[PDB]
């Protein structure tokens, strides 16, 4: 990805995380589990959601009857009508096509960026209180129980 | 104790294409392309279409003896022709500005067929009972269009006629009529006497005059003679005046109508049902939500832009990378 | 001691829309959409337009007794019609290829009106002083178009006429003329005698001939008779030849002109001023800087693409997040 | 933002910084103040400036008279003329519309990226000579007077 | 010991433009715009075009005595006219629906010229040997079109003629013919006697009739009389019938052809060679790979969209920053 | 650049690196040299390659003859034909033009991103076993021979 996280330094996805797009997975002496980061996931939803609508909402179309009907002595204007149809039907094809290829790249980058920001959000809080194991994981130098694991999630981790 | 930040993954196999990569399997996608259709000709904006079936537009309007079922036609949002719409101008000739008429009658709010010039006592001292042909046969019997009247000749004299109609219908009135062109000058007299006849139509917005263009020409479905069909939309309060010394296939019935905007003529053998739609195509109604469609270039209504694409899938989720 | 890196913020309330968010308040934006207009009909590229006011194109060119003020018309970059342009062909009839003429005369470099066939001694032994009608009334008095001459009949004989004009103006010459069609054959004789008359115009690039299409038709603003108007652009060095046994509304005045490209006919009741513009619309002149406009679909000049948008604001600054 | 700084780890803007888009705010024993980073601000200007012009300059249009005029017997070609007008007036609408929505996202990202690069520009120079307080601020472990605060700004900060 | 991560750089001077910067020198780029052309008129999809040279379309089809070399024409994918295509209707007149014919004959699969109505014994008791003019001179000598036959008059009597042709060629047949219009009624008799003559063509899909429109008009390349040219595509199995009392420039040769789709008429003085192409323009063939071209708006084939651009260079490599 | 590396914290390019787009240059007691990172370079190629094709492949065009031919009495439909030609020839111009300006910015960003990810790929492996000299260079605190320099390249550098 553009932001190096997805299929990057965090080479795989969690089939176990089922309640969100980006999240955490902790493992302390008390247990372990997947928990989606709600805030960043919702926001991504809101955004992607709003993106799709735009691509659909912005498509204005008025009542029209494409077909025409020209007699054997109106070939020129008939071919002109053709040129218009083929014409617009070349614009929208190339456009719709690239619009997708491009916005797709964008969407994926967006997700990557979101994962990286989350990773770095945590990376910031922990600081020297955990070693980075270049795979999206942090191993605390101290014991971190569920309240602790919670604090890092809801972004309120203590003195690092 | 460790905490790892990661991303979702599932059993999805949807694949999208990106500027840099093809077929990237992603967790959640959305389709922006419509390629389905109920394979039914539906109502367009709550108004059913007009089926012609065996008959075509010319046949319907002129009154071809095979379109007797369309004599009650009313409403309609767009017209439907079939791969069987071959029943039209049973009597050879040119339908002047036909395409133009087809287009202008695409959509109609109200449509009422009335006797503008009644057969009985309208053309007295004129033969209005011989105007039949074998080209327009009704159940073996020789007949003729039901909305036009073939004025022949009474005995051995065909006097100069002249009838007028003032549109007091409170809406446009479609007046249809024809001029007949015999294959010779021998037939031109045995029917209209005056081998120098003429026909003239006058409206405040019309004036073209006619003369029989008798000439030697092949025979079509029987006749060597030809009948050119003409029409005109008579505005409210205006008065159309006809007069002729012969060769006039006088209007018998005319339609009082109210045109709204303008749709078109879908031609398809697809079934017709009480379904509704905002976009209609030859193969069936399409959904008008997605920004693009590849069901058919020729559509009527508020439709999705037609594209040669086969796949326009948009990613919504992220790269799908499962495995454990 | 601390140092912080941050970003600007201000009192701006401009808001733009983004693919992911709506109404993001930003510090500095730019508008790419034009939705203003001086509500004035201006000069287009330094050349004022031609106002017709009460008169319409047909009225102006034919010489309707109400367009006497447009008899000096000159220059003009585009033509202006008003919701009062009802003064045109005061005498009922069809203006052949009218739309085509309107379009071709949209823009004119030079325009000079000259007497191609002077009333006095041009049609001797022909009545050139009775060609007046009440349909074309000038201050209560019965009159007629000022650029066409209604040739009647002298005494009880209307001889065959024939006049020619060779365009030696060094530029195209717009020749206008009409053919008259009486309601009967009774009027056809009392005016042109020869109840079999004809009119014929010949140019090296013209030849259509005419015959009075006398027919019974309604009356419009008085007359039951009809006059079809015809025009043609006579190329330099070419010679147009007229000749008729009757029913010719002969050209009296013609225009020698120089067409450049081609604009159009704006129709609006908006005031006209000495302002200039590169893009003109019915509601007023628009600015030709921004890439898009929503002032009016129908425009003339080098204009911004028309769009159904209401807001196309582009961010230039960053997200605005003040508060202290 | 895509780059995590704007309304991200630097959640707010400086109403006090009035001479630029991205900048600094120091606080030493000698005083305090806002100072826009001139180089990165100018460049952003030059770029955004050039971007706008492109979107405007690239719009080529020749002299045209849209209107047409067709008589009651030219409905087909009149409707064809309609199809062209509606046609182009559907292309530009969808395009202008998305062109803005997209370039807007881009512009904002651009700014974010610029702030992040500036932050990281400094973060680099200081190194262990200051603690990062996850809010776009650095607190030197040493005394940093105005010459010092200057050095970091004009990117010439000493031995870290 | 140190390791540094860096990026490539070279001697490239290619420059691209970006939304934020102009003329960014980059290591590797690609051009998306075509601005070259072999300056040759090539074969389009493996089928050579049809050169007319001195002759123009009308000249070629009618049989102008200067287009004798095009009498074997066959195949062709598109037609080529030159800045010397001035040899057409050597005898003044209007070529009805000419543009339409030019367009419909743009592309032709098979084209065979045959004698539909042979000069010898087809018009006996009619002068078929005087139909020559000086306007259509062949090597000083007075001649006439090679595919049309000017039927004069035998002695002092011009009887009513009538010939038919039934297309049994198994493909459309292009029938060309003309109606002649003398400058007077004096010439109308000395050639066709009947100063009231007429011409009539009848097909199952045709019927327009004609009458000599004798009128006073200027003279073009000699003649004051005018000949209007008409054509029609006779469908298989259909029968075209001609008959006239005079003024018929009867068809002599007609073409049996097979039209595929429809290309156009390139007009250029560029050389013609055995090269092939998918896209052809007036200046030369273009390459059909890149998505855009600025060689010429008017093109034929599957071409790159024409754009006013001069430079559409796409970066493929990265910013080039050398120096050591 | 958007990602701060190109003409950013790595202000120049290596004319000496001739076998790839992004790479390394080491200097140990045993020698020195340029070596392109094969994996990231190939991938960039594959991607840019695929990008170009898209922009070309997606351009659908059918057999057409633009020219028309109208007589002196068909000015309106002739001008209509003009409107279509100018029309489409305004769409493609603006589009092709912006398509390039935008995808160009994108391509360059892409490269920058790739360099940054590579830099950070290494930065990760070395950790405290080398000092970052804000110029894309790392100076090991230990001796790093060719096998070692290799390990960092093929991403298998030891205990950091
Ligand atoms: C006028 C009338 O009573 N209709 C006739 C019809 C007309 O004579 C004809 O349509 C005029 O164009 O002719 C009908 O018989 C057709 C019959 O006519 C001969 O002249 C011809 O030689 C035959 O081949 C044959 O076509 C008809 O049905 O059309 C009778 C009808 O009553
Ligand atoms: C030829 C001439 O001198 N103009 C007449 C004009 C013409 O007779 C008319 O335009 C020919 O179409 O007629 C004028 O009177 C109109 C008068 O004509 C009667 O025939 C009719 O029955 C009446 O209703 C009425 O229209 C005219 O002003 O048009 C007189 C004019 O002098
Ligand atoms: C019918 C015939 O034999 N062709 C004539 C030709 C025709 O008379 C003419 O094309 C009919 O429109 O005329 C030719 O001489 C031209 C000659 O005609 C005089 O009438 C005129 O006054 C002269 O100026 C001059 O044009 C011709 O070559 O066109 C002779 C030809 O044999
Ligand atoms: C309307 O169309 C039908 C169908 O083409 C006409 O009938 C044709 O096809 C029939 C086959 O079942 C046959 O009757 C003929 O091939 C043909 N018509 C003839 C010459 O009989 C039908 O005649 C038309 N209806 C009318 C009379 O207008
Ligand atoms: C030109 O247009 C005017 C305006 O329509 C014509 O006058 C019409 O309207 C007038 C109202 O003030 C009335 O005079 C009539 O309703 C109507 N014209 C008639 C029949 O008098 C005016 O006549 C026209 N000018 C001419 C004579 O060509
Ligand atoms: C076909 O076109 C040529 C070229 O215009 C005609 O000849 C013209 O030009 C010649 C110059 O070399 C001269 O002969 C004349 O200016 C002109 N023709 C005349 C009036 O002689 C040529 O005549 C045409 N061929 C025919 C006879 O159809
Ligand atoms: C995929 O997983 C979903 C749970 O989200 C389940 O409902 C569905 O049956 C599964 N189908 C497949 C692709 O195996
Ligand atoms: C994706 O790969 C190719 C495109 O490169 C495509 O033809 C095929 O349908 C897809 N295969 C799968 C199952 O991913
Ligand atoms: C906003 O701030 C500017 C200073 O840049 C000032 O000139 C203007 O009056 C202020 N207006 C508002 C929105 O209060
Ligand atoms: C922005 O919010 C909505 C769009 O979601 C819009 O209707 C409104 O005009 C704006 N409100 C303000 C003042 O920001
Ligand atoms: C540029 O370098 C290439 C090697 O890749 C060499 O072949 C070429 O001759 C050089 N030309 C220039 C621009 O000096
Ligand atoms: C790039 O700079 C300008 C555009 O700003 C352009 O005119 C010129 O051709 C280029 N100059 C060079 C050699 O880079």
TrEMBL record, chains B, C, E:
GO molecular function term, any single one: host cell surface receptor binding
Record carries keyword Acyltransferase: no
Disulfide bonds: 42-275, 55-67, 90-136, 279-303
Swiss-Prot/TrEMBL GO biological process terms: clathrin-dependent endocytosis of virus by host cell; fusion of virus membrane with host endosome membrane; fusion of virus membrane with host plasma membrane; virion attachment to host cell
Membrane-related topology note: Single-pass type I membrane protein
Subcellular location: Host apical cell membrane
Domain of life of the organism encoding this protein: Viruses
Glycosylated residue positions: 11, 23
Major subcellular location class: host cell
Keyword flag Transmembrane: yes
GO CC list: host cell plasma membrane; viral envelope
Key words, A-Z: Clathrin- and caveolin-independent endocytosis of virus by host, Clathrin-mediated endocytosis of virus by host, Disulfide bond, Fusion of virus membrane with host endosomal membrane, Fusion of virus membrane with host membrane, Glycoprotein, Hemagglutinin, Host cell membrane, Host membrane, Host-virus interaction, Lipoprotein, Membrane, Palmitate, Signal, Transmembrane, Transmembrane helix, Viral attachment to host cell, Viral envelope protein, Viral penetration into host cytoplasm, Virion, Virus endocytosis by host, Virus entry into host cell
Family: Belongs to the influenza viruses hemagglutinin family.
Assembly: Homotrimer of disulfide-linked HA1-HA2. Interacts with human CACNA1C.
Function, as annotated: Binds to sialic acid-containing receptors on the cell surface, bringing about the attachment of the virus particle to the cell. This attachment induces virion internalization of about two third of the virus particles through clathrin-dependent endocytosis and about one third through a clathrin- and caveolin-independent pathway. Plays a major role in the determination of host range restriction and virulence. Class I viral fusion protein.
Descriptive protein name: Hemagglutinin
Source species: Influenza A virus
Lineage, highest ranks first: Viruses, Riboviria, Orthornavirae, Negarnaviricota, Polyploviricotina
Gene for this chain: HA
Shown residues in whole-protein numbering: 15 to 338 of 563
């Amino acid at each position: 990805g553009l932001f190096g996280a997805m299929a990057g330094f965090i080479e795989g996805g969690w089939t176990g995380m089922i309640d969100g797009w980006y999240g955490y997975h902790h493992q302390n002496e008390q247990g372990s589990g997947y928990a989606a980061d709600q805030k960043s996931t919702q926001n991504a939803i809101d955004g992607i959601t709003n993106k799709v609508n735009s691509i659909i909402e912005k498509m204005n179309t008025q009542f029209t009857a494409v077909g025409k009907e020209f007699n054997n002595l109106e070939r020129r204007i008939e071919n002109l009508n053709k040129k218009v149809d083929d014409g617009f039907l070349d614009v929208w094809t190339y456009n719709a096509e690239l619009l997708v290829l491009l916005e797709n790249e964008r969407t994926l980058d967006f997700h990557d960026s979101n994962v990286r920001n989350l990773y770095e959000k945590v990376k910031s809080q922990l600081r020297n209180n955990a070693k980075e194991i270049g795979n999206g994981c942090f191993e605390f130098y101290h014991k971190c129980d569920d309240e602790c694991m919670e604090s890092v999630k809801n972004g309120t981790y203590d003195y690092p | 104790d460790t905490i790892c930040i990661g991303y979702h993954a599932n059993n999805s196999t949807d694949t999208v294409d990106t500027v840099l990569e093809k077929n990237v399997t992603v967790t959640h996608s959305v389709n922006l392309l419509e390629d389905n259709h109920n394979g039914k000709l539906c109502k367009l904006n709550g108004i059913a279409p007009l089926q012609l079936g065996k008959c075509n537009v010319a046949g319907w309007l002129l009154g071809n003896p095979e379109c007797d079922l369309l004599l009650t036609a009313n409403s309609w949002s767009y017209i439907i022709e079939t791969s069987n719409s071959e029943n039209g101008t049973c009597y050879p000739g040119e339908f002047i500005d036909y395409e133009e008429l087809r287009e202008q009658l695409s959509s109609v709010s109200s449509f009422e067929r009335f006797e503008i010039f009644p057969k009985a006592s309208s053309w007295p001292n004129h033969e209005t009972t011989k105007g039949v042909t074998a080209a327009c046969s009704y159940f073996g019997a020789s007949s003729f269009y039901r909305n036009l009247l073939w004025i022949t000749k009474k005995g051995t004299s065909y006097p100069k006629l002249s009838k007028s109609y003032t549109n007091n219908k409170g809406k446009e009135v479609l007046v249809l009529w024809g001029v007949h062109h015999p294959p010779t000058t021998s037939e031109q007299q045995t029917l209209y006497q005056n081998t120098d006849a003429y026909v003239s139509v006058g409206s405040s917005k019309y004036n073209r005059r006619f003369t029989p263009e008798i000439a030697a020409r092949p025979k079509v479905r029987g006749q060597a003679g030809r009948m050119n069909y003409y029409w005109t939309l008579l505005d409210q309060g205006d008065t159309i005046t006809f007069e002729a010394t012969g060769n006039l296939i006088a209007p018998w019935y005319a339609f009082a109508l109210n045109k709204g905007s303008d749709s078109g003529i879908i031609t398809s053998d697809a079934p017709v049902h009480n379904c509704d739609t905002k976009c209609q195509t030859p193969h069936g109604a399409i959904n008008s939500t997605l920004p693009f469609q590849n069901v058919h270039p020729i559509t009527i209504g508020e439709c999705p832009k037609y594209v040669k694409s086969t796949k326009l899938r948009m990613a919504t989720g992220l790269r799908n990378i499962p495995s454990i």
